[PDB]
Design a protein around this ligand. Structure first.
Ligand SMILES: [Mg+2]
Ligand SMILES: [Zn+2]
Lengths: 349, 96, 158, 263
RNA sequence: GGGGGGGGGGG
DNA sequence: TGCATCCGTGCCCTGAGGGTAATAAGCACAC
DNA sequence: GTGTGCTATAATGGGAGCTGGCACGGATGCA
């Protein structure tokens, strides 16, 4: 019955669709190509978007189960519109009915081919284990590559299907591994750079008989590489650690039990800031109301924005020269008060 | 730990001893003003260095952590008053 | 960062709650990162495991389903019927809330049919489109297992 | 026909054509109907006895089945198969849960409560307890099926730069990453109209991903960090146990203004 | 029906 | 009623250790 | 620098079973 163990279930399911003989494969590919040509013909005839007719025929052949919005279609996909399109296509004369029949058969042929060629995906994916992704994820990405290969396969060239399908399955698996295997994402070109660098380091360790220094690696990489670039690449390729890992050999003490919180201010720091605000208010209360307002509007103690001299002068209705002079004399008073009282020295940190 | 300049652990048994002594305010200090009550501990330090008495303790941060983690498990935990009307412990930051 | 947008256009409390157009980040305290939740919109509903594997299962008890049956349905091992649509299986009409295995569901939904390969050079006894009963010999080495119409797939010779 | 213009078989003159030596023979439990004029129904459509098939209503179907139009043979086949409504997994479970009438079930369980037998009475009692809890609580049963998973705030699963320059992460980020990956892949596979096996496997692994996110190791093997055997820490394992939230951070704490020394 | 376990010291 | 299987529990605080781990082609346009 | 496409001998069911030293209570199937 295979309770749990999804891989056994997947294998037993894919083992129920029979393998294809060559003539059946050729006929299915011919049906798919003819159906695509028929869809193009219907697009020309009815003057509609080929993807629309394609999705309508696919929905009809699949059944009422799968209805949902298509990213490419501009109109929303609902049963009303698909019934409208089905009735519009069922109103055409006798001659064009054969095109609709061929398209409806080609969709089923495509489904049968995609179902038939899944164990090839499984066999290609079985060699990618251990690179950060689980087996079933690789299987599904290979299945997507297989679907694309089924779309792109041309049977006129007399080549077997697996020959063209393997390329797409392999490329899909590699792209998925390069895109999704890391917690912090690295672009695919940089991933290829990391892999090439690791390969070069492995080779140089093999010949040299010891782990090479950065300069030897950079020399082996060729032009454009120096030791600093190799060190930077190695620094880039590092994977984070989990806070829930046991540091020693315990199972109760972990890595996060020793990481401090540097963001939120400590009580000492918050108290220092509060005392600084209170002392600044007390010192400014030794000034006049207007000259305190001037500096508060200039520094950001009021409303939090640093106002220009023109803005404060307009607010007080005075000349920018007058606002500058009163600001300067207020700052002189502040300097005198701090020199006489010494209440802000220790707050310079 | 000594190396991290940390503090002593007031475990379950110490809380049981405090409860058996009937010392409610000392226990409430241990649970809030001396750990994971940010506003409470900041105001307590300010009041002490100003010579005043420490203020009223507030909701611990670990209770908010527990509430959010339970909301992550698709469970709705609500704090209710005597009339069963909702009372917010996040002062509106977590509510749109 | 407290009271500061991502792009740095709004960097203090003079805006509080205002949403930056460039980065889309609301200007509030940083501690809101401890409280605000998100969500993931699944394309297929999923059962909460607490109400499935906590004996006795609450969903199973409500639906009068045993643990094995609920496990088989939830993790895709058997079907469950919501509307019989007048179907009948092995002479017994299908009743609602019955469990069908994949072969039974397929023979109900898409019909039953089989494909018999013939050895090379051996000609078919029956002709194309001819009705055939179970056990009737379609080829010297082929014995039919179901009564139904027989069709040619690929004739080598014209 | 052939791929190339040559090797095509064009009739020399008037005659008849016969086909011999099939590669294989398919036996299908179906009803055949020849037709002359235009056919009303295309392939894949399902018909009921009496539904019009072709010839503008002259020929009609006698059996519930699926229409298979063979244009080569100019024949409409009806493969005997029904439109039975059967579903799988949490979608079917939720559909069933939305159709429950708790009052009628309460009445039925109250009737069963009076049966003489011990076991039947006890089972009815348990079921009625659950039903009455749902009734009085005001919680719809279908809410036990999730349609939109909630996402914990980042600061409770932080991505923090350690002093040495490295990064430290929580396992919850990995579980959420797996969930999002599988959900997006499901959406893409649905957009492409993939066969049912692929969609079924994807839905099953999505269910397993949600199960691991909620309670890792409850069913099957726990998900582990690549190249390691240490299970990831789900939401369930943080709340329970000696190292859980309750006992470690709520029933006991670490306090300020404290010291220690030898006595 | 098919794979277990947190090292050593102090009190 | 008597067996069989699965899940849940198993003392408290503190110190020092010191943690990072076996890889499949790339190249061409585009912005 | 990063995101995306594609390529044409033929290839068509993984990982091997890294195995066994806690023990008792309870709760439900299953006789
Ligand atoms: Mg060099
Ligand atoms: Zn911004």
């Amino acid at each position: 019955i295979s309770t749990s163990d999804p891989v056994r279930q997947y294998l037993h399911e894919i083992g129920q669709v029979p393998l294809l003989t060559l003539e059946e494969e050729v006929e299915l590919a011919r049906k798919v190509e003819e159906g695509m040509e028929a869809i193009k013909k219907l697009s020309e005839i009815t003057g509609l978007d080929p993807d629309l007719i394609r999705e309508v025929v696919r929905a009809k052949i699949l059944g009422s189960a799968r209805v949902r919005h298509i990213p490419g279609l501009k109109e929303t996909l609902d049963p009303k519109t698909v019934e409208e399109i089905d009735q519009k296509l069922k109103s055409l004369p006798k001659e064009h009915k054969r095109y609709l029949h061929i398209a409806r058969e080609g969709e089923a042929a495509r489904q049968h081919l995609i179902e038939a060629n899944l164990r090839l995906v499984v066999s290609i994916a079985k060699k990618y284990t251990g690179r950060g992704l689980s087996f079933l994820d690789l299987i599904q990405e290979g299945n997507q590559g297989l679907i694309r290969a089924v779309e792109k396969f041309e049977y006129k060239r007399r080549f077997k299907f697996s020959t063209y399908a393997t390329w797409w399955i392999r490329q899909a698996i590699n792209r998925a591994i390069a895109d999704q295997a890391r917690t912090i994402r690295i672009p695919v070109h940089m991933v290829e750079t990391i892999n090439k660098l690791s390969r070069t380091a492995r080779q140089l360790q093999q010949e040299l008989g010891r782990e090479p220094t950065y300069e030897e690696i950079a020399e082996a990489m060729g032009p454009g590489w120096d030791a600093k670039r190799v060190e930077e690449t190695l620094k880039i390729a590092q994977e984070p650690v989990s806070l829930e890992t046991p540091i020693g050999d315990e199972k109760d003490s972990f890595y996060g039990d020793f990481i401090p919180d540097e963001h939120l201010p400590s009580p000492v720091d918050a108290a220092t800031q509060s005392l600084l605000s209170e002392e600044l208010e007390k010192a400014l209360s030794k000034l006049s109301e207007r000259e305190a307002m001037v500096l508060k509007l200039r520094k950001g103690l009021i409303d939090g924005r640093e106002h220009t001299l023109e803005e404060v002068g307009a607010f007080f209705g005075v000349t920018r020269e007058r606002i500058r002079q009163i600001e300067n004399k207020a700052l002189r008073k502040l300097k005198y008060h701090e020199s006489r009282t010494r209440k802000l020295r220790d707050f310079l940190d | 730990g000594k190396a991290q300049f940390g503090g002593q652990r007031f475990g379950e048994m110490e809380v049981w001893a405090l409860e058996a002594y009937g010392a409610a305010h000392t226990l409430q200090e241990m649970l809030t003003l001396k750990s994971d009550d940010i506003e409470g501990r900041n105001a307590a330090y300010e009041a002490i260095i100003k010579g005043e008495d420490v203020p009223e303790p507030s909701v611990p941060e670990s209770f908010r952590v527990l509430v959010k983690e339970l909301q992550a498990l698709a469970l709705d935990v609500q704090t209710l008053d005597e009339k069963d009307n909702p009372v917010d412990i996040f002062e509106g930051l977590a509510s749109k | 960062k407290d009271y500061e947008c991502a792009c740095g256009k709004y960097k203090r409390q003079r805006f509080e709650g205002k949403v930056c157009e460039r980065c889309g980040v609301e200007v509030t305290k940083s501690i809101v990162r401890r409280y605000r939740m998100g969500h993931i919109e699944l394309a297929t509903p999923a059962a909460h495991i607490w109400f499935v594997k906590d004996v006795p299962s609450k969903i199973g008890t409500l639906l009068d389903l045993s643990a094995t049956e609920l496990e088989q349905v939830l993790y895709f091992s058997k079907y469950i019927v919501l509307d019989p649509k007048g179907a009948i299986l092995n002479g017994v009409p299908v009743e609602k809330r019955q469990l069908l295995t994949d072969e039974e569901y397929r023979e109900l939904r898409y019909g039953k049919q089989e494909t018999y390969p013939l050895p090379p050079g051996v000609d078919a006894l029956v002709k194309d489109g001819e009705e055939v009963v179970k056990g009737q010999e379609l080829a010297p080495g082929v014995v039919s297992r179901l009564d139904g119409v027989a069709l040619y797939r690929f004739p080598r010779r014209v | 026909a052939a791929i190339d213009p040559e090797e095509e078989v064009i009739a020399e003159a008037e005659g008849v054509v016969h086909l011999h030596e099939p590669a294989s023979i398919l036996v299908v439990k179906a009803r055949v109907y020849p037709f002359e004029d235009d056919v009303e129904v295309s392939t894949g459509d399902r018909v009921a006895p009496g539904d019009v098939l072709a010839d503008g209503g002259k020929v009609k179907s006698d059996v519930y089945g699926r229409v298979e139009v063979d244009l080569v043979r100019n024949v409409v086949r009806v493969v005997e198969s029904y439109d039975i409504d059967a579903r799988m997994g949490a979608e079917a479970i939720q559909q069933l849960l939305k159709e429950l009438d708790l009052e009628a079930l309460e009445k039925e369980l109250l009737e069963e409560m009076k049966h003489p037998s011990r076991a039947r009475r006890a089972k009815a009692r348990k079921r009625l307890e659950v039903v009455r809890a749902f009734l009085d609580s005001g919680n719809r049963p279908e809410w036990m099926i999730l349609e939109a998973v909630p996402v914990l705030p980042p600061d409770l699963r932080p991505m923090v730069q350690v002093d040495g320059g490295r990064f430290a992460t929580s396992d919850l980020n990995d579980l959420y990453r797996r969930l999002i990956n599988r959900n997006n892949r499901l959406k893409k596979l649905l957009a492409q109209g993939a066969p049912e096996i692929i969609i079924r496997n994807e839905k099953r692994m999505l269910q397993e991903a949600v199960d691991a996110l909620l309670d890792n190791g409850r069913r099957g093997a726990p998900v582990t960090n690549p190249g390691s055997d240490r299970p990831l820490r789900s939401l369930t394992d943080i709340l329970s146990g000696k190292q859980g939230r309750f006992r470690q951070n709520l029933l006991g704490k670490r306090v300020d203004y404290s010291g220690r020394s030898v006595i």
